[PDB]
Amino acid sequence: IIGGTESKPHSRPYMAYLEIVTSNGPSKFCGGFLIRRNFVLTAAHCAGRSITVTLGAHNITEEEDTWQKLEVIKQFRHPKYNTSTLHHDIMLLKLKEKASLTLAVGTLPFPSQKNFVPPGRMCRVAGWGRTGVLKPGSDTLQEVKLRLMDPQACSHFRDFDHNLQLCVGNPRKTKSAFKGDSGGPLLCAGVAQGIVSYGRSDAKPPAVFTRISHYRPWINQILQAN
Ligand SMILES: CCc1ccc2c(CCNC(C)=O)c([C@@H](C3=C(O)[C@@H](c4ccccc4)CC3=O)c3ccccc3)[nH]c2c1
Ligand SMILES: [Zn+2]
Structure with a gap:
């Protein structure tokens, strides 16, 4: 993180x-x-x-x-x-x-509802992964608040798909998940909506998360x- x-x-x-x-x-x-x-x-x-x-x-x-x-x-x-x-x-x-x-x-069980989550809102992600591109994994659990972006924000990931994946992290903010964090949950109002997947090697947001729904x-x- x-x-x-x-x-x-x-x-x-x-x-x-x-x-x-x-x-x-x-x-x-x-x-x-x-x-x-x-x-x-x-x-x-x-x-x-x-x-x-x-x-x-x-x-x-x-x-x-x-x-x-x-x-x-x-x-x-x-x-x-x-x-x-x-x-x-x-x-x-x-x-x-x-x-x-x-x-x-x-x-953390899923609720019955499985509605498609649209862009706009803030969500939170946690993990023990790297605290910077050139830094080591964290000894302590870390967490960060990230914005759900419109899918066009992730167009440069040529294999990104809006139906399969969430686009996560405002490009103007120096906040993200990174290596070591993959597999962790993204929670939106206390409900898991995404799984940390991948992004750029240089950690510039946004990044790609599996869409759980x-x-x-x-x-x-x-x-x-x-
Ligand atoms: C969302 C936050 C974020 C942003 C960027 C990345 C990148 C860097 C992606 N770089 C590319 C794809 O150019 C990774 C990649 C990566 C791991 O997950 C680590 C790992 C642990 C256990 C088993 C295998 C691997 C070691 C590693 O290099 C990775 C590799 C294989 C597929 C996907 C991702 N994860 C990320 C997570
Ligand atoms: Zn304790």
Whole structure:
């Protein structure tokens, strides 16, 4: 998160810190959010050979009693996820066991309504990702308020699609998500409407987020069958 503030510790109890393991390189990092006691929603590009989930964290360098380190049994990447266009950047992680409910750890279930969110309003995003283009990931959970932009603002992303994705962040403001934040939620009036996906390498807003409303049928399908 670039240009944000430190979250009040444990104020977003659904937030998940993801360590992504692969065979031929060191750990990489994403965000996610707990939508059921044994399911975390995140981005498909965060898939790996294996993934570890930490719930209940604020400062990720200091072990505390709120931490729950949880094993992932299976990854459900969207079947149409495309590494060229980056369409359908969404994935569900099934946890080996159900998380414990505490003050610091709880679910963020979707409401029944699944209306299409138009441009104009302000939303908030949180994560442990880089605090600048040339800076390291944050030790503490950070968050920032970003504006939903008209789709033409994201035209320069040639594979952007208004029906599939949200266009997020006023170009005139030095505020954004960045690397390490992918997979985290964008909340609009307390409701998750987007998932952090991708933007420019230089972090100039706006950036591209998965539009959750479009994927509600797929999400429901996976949850009901698993
Ligand atoms: C919205 C905020 C924002 C803005 C810009 C980016 C970019 C930079 C995108 N640069 C391009 C596409 O030119 C990225 C890319 C990136 C990660 O997510 C990190 C990563 C962690 C775990 C597994 C794999 C990778 C390491 C990395 O390089 C990335 C890679 C693969 C597909 C999509 C995104 N994420 C972003 C998020
Ligand atoms: Zn604490």
